[PDB]
Amino acid sequence: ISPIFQGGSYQLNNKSIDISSLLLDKLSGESQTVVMKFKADKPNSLQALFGLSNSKAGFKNNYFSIFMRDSGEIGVEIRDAQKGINYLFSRPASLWGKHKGQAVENTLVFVSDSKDKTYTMYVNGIEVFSETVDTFLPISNINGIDKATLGAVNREGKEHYLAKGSIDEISLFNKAISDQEVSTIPLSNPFQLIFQSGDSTQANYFRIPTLYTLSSGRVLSSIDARYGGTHDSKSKINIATSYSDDNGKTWSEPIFAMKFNDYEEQLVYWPRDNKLKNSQISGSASFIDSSIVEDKKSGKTILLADVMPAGIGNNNANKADSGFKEINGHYYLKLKKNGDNDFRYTVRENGVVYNETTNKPTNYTINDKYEVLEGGKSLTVEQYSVDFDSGSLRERHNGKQVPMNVFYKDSLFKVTPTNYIAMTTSQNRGESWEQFKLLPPFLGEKHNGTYLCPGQGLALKSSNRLIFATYTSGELTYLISDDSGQTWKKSSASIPFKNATAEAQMVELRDGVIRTFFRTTTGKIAYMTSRDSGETWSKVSYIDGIQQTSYGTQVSAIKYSQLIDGKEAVILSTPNSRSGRKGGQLVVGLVNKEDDSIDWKYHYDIDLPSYGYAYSAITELPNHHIGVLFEKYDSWSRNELHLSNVVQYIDLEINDLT
């Protein structure tokens, strides 16, 4: 079905374009679709792209607008004072500005549907809001509309919300086009999605991306599949993975590397209003923060993640307890039974549940999947589902039985409410994953477990050594295996911080020489160096030339395989900003062989300084391109919680960076 208006190549240079004569008399009926392809690489703070207004005296609040902010937020207003209606729908972090130095053509589709009383906005193929109202307001039914305007809104004869940008194509339809028809509108996206809302994970949200290039050429990604909005644990979160066999061009349907069944995997639209946005799934077990490494010797892929029992996160995790008991220099997982006040059980060899008060064993065993068996028979619990039908979050039994797991709220036997580290392996490069195994405590019986640094582990090039960085109060705790992840030992490296989220990632500068880059609380990224393949660690130094916030952000890092400007090169990915998680950059550093110092020579801006960029994952693709999977939004900001499809993937070449 044809547009009632089609126009193109409009330059918005702080001067509105009047299209009233062309458009206004064409508008008919109560349903409309706006399709617009536009660039804005230097937007004003708040600017309107399109406006339909009553421009007369006394009617300044009678207008429809499509607007954007220099934060990347997109929205509309639909206002009519006579009707007492002032609608505003918007979503932060919905836009691109630039990619490889060039302004990005954003594709916006806005649907105003009088029959369903629903307003829906898509940007770049992503639905960013869909809102139904009791009292519908057709956009051309605003009392006294007499102006159609590009690049401003005409109110009382003046240009409000002047825009800087361009509208390369704009079309209007006297129909609410279907979601199907929307899907056929061609896009000019600079990015792709690996994980996305409605995929096999059925999580509506994703955080904490990782990337790793396997020896076969397959590129593997892992991620937090986050169900209860974007909240850290406590929530329901699983760890999902996807891989690409064609240098990141296409990606497999995700599968789970680590998951719990105590709560249903539900695709939920988590409330974003101030009253409810802190609603949190409070009774589910969860995983959080994954990291991947490949072992050259066995060929296995190893993935670790933090594990949280039901109701548990970092804020309420039992510090002062590892969750294990030491009996002979061996560690056993503690368990508490229904009705006891203390943990009077342990899980011994082969999974036998022992009673500790009487050193007498039980008729209960824990299988490989941490599920409870009584006399070899699988115990079950009823699953929970969540909903907001009542006007607040509700967590309730759904009639389905699932194996009873010791990390569950409803389990007969429960682990200590603290954080653990789990490991799984894959023998087929991410096509399937084993059942996870808990790592032992490394800092003692009465120390809670360390926190995994999300991203990559390190496989040393000249040995079989595998390292996963973790952090805790006062130190980085490196976990080291020389036997394909069968056994681990720790290597502690003190840092001058108490209670820092010291997320750390490593690069091997040359054989046996590791530089670790890490998040701090100082506004600068720190580093330390090992020259004995991780046995001992230097004092902490700081990078100048990159700014982070006081609270910091995860940083990703790789050793590039090729020389640049004749030198060994390292590439860092991080926001570069002392204000928020925005201004994403890749920073190319050249190693000085004299002293292993790094000269941070090239800074590549991923997108606008004002556009969001948070946790990130970088990998050198088999073709020597650079793959970047990153949170394209401010994942700290309390205004940008619970956004869908903001973790995105781009492909870059080194010449783009320099």
Ligand X SMILES: COc1cccc(CNCCS(=O)(=O)O)c1
332 is catalytic: no
Cβ nearer to ligand X, comparing 12 with 317 = 317
SS3 633: coil
User: Does 232 engage in binding with ligand X (CB under 6 A)?
Assistant: yes
* Tokens (6 digits) for 305: 């993640």
**Restricting to residues 605-644, which ones interact with ligand X according to CB under 6 A?**
635-636
Question: Where is 655: in which H helix or E strand?
Answer: helix 654-657
Catalytic hit among 77, 127, 199, 232: 232
DSSP state letters, 9-67: EEEEESS-EE-HHHHGGG--SS-EEEEEEEE-SS--SEEEEEEEE--STT-TT-EEEEE
SS3 350: helix
* Tokens (6 digits) for 241: 């993975």
* Residues in contact with 555: Cβ distance below 8 Å, sequence separation at least 6, in sequence order: 503, 505, 517, 518, 519, 525, 572, 573, 574, 616
Q: Can you point out the beta strands (E) in 404-545?
A: 413-414, 420-426, 437-438, 451-452, 455-456, 458-459, 466-472, 475-481, 489-494, 504-510, 513-518, 526-530, 541-542
- 155 is an annotated ligand-binding site residue: no
Stretch that binds ligand X, among 37-45, 277-285, 313-321, 488-496 (CB under 6 A): 313-321
CB of 235 to ligand X, least distance (A): 9
Cβ nearer to ligand X, comparing 138 with 474 = 474
Stretch that binds ligand X, among 185-193, 308-316, 462-470, 534-542 (CB under 6 A): 308-316
CB of 326 to ligand X, least distance (A): 24
CB of 313 to ligand X, least distance (A): 3
User: Does 473 engage in binding with ligand X (CB under 6 A)?
Assistant: no
> Are the CB atoms for 278 and 399 separated by under 8 Å?
no
615 is catalytic: yes
Cβ nearer to ligand X, comparing 106 with 233 = 233
**Restricting to residues 394-423, which ones interact with ligand X according to CB under 6 A?**
419
Cβ nearer to ligand X, comparing 65 with 456 = 456
Q: Can you point out the beta strands (E) in 114-218?
A: 118-123, 126-132, 147-150, 153-155, 158-160, 164-173, 205-213
**Restricting to residues 34-53, which ones interact with ligand X according to CB under 6 A?**
none
Q: Among candidates 74, 243, 286, 209, which has minimal Cα distance to 614?
A: 209
The number of residues in the chain equals 658
Of the residues 289, 607, 634, 640, which one makes contact with ligand X according to CB under 6 A: 289
Of the residues 314, 378, 383, 385, which one makes contact with ligand X according to CB under 6 A: 314
295 is catalytic: no
H-only helix segments in 126-171? none
* Residues in contact with 79: Cβ distance below 8 Å, sequence separation at least 6, in sequence order: 61, 62, 63, 64, 85, 86, 87, 142
In SS3 terms, 298-322 reads as: CCCEEEEEEEECCCCCCCCCCCCCC
- 429 is an annotated ligand-binding site residue: no
Cβ nearer to ligand X, comparing 190 with 449 = 449
Sign of CA dihedral 155, 156, 157, 162: negative
Site size with ligand X, rule: CB under 6 A: 13
Cβ nearer to ligand X, comparing 64 with 420 = 420
According to DSSP, residue 288 is labeled: E
CB of 518 to ligand X, least distance (A): 13
Stretch that binds ligand X, among 89-97, 140-148, 250-258, 306-314 (CB under 6 A): 306-314
User: Does 224 engage in binding with ligand X (CB under 6 A)?
Assistant: no
How remote is the C-alpha of 185 from its chain's centroid? 27
Of the residues 364, 451, 517, 602, which one makes contact with ligand X according to CB under 6 A: 451
CB of 438 to ligand X, least distance (A): 15
- 348 is an annotated ligand-binding site residue: no
User: Does 306 engage in binding with ligand X (CB under 6 A)?
Assistant: yes
User: Does 67 engage in binding with ligand X (CB under 6 A)?
Assistant: no
Of the residues 501, 529, 549, 610, which one makes contact with ligand X according to CB under 6 A: 501
Cβ nearer to ligand X, comparing 420 with 649 = 420
Q: Among candidates 638, 644, 641, 648, which has minimal Cα distance to 122?
A: 644
Catalytic hit among 199, 503, 508, 651: 503
**Measured between alpha carbons, how far is 299 from 185 in angstroms, rounded to an integer?**
44
Of the residues 174, 233, 291, 425, which one makes contact with ligand X according to CB under 6 A: 233
CB of 75 to ligand X, least distance (A): 25
**Restricting to residues 249-288, which ones interact with ligand X according to CB under 6 A?**
288
Of the residues 97, 313, 534, 583, which one makes contact with ligand X according to CB under 6 A: 313
* Tokens (6 digits) for 262: 């105590």
Cβ nearer to ligand X, comparing 306 with 605 = 306
CB of 475 to ligand X, least distance (A): 16
Catalytic hit among 615, 633, 640, 649: 615
**Measured between alpha carbons, how far is 168 from 106 in angstroms, rounded to an integer?**
10
Cβ nearer to ligand X, comparing 160 with 226 = 226
Stretch that binds ligand X, among 112-120, 238-246, 311-319, 470-478 (CB under 6 A): 311-319
**Measured between alpha carbons, how far is 213 from 247 in angstroms, rounded to an integer?**
9
CB of 284 to ligand X, least distance (A): 13
**Measured between alpha carbons, how far is 642 from 640 in angstroms, rounded to an integer?**
7
CB of 208 to ligand X, least distance (A): 8
* Tokens (6 digits) for 465: 């050594």
Footprint of ligand X on this chain (CB under 6 A)? 232-233, 288-289, 306, 313-315, 419, 451, 501, 635-636
- Provide the annotated binding site for substrate: 207, 519, 581
Active site residues: 232, 503, 615
Residues flagged as binding site: 207, 519, 581
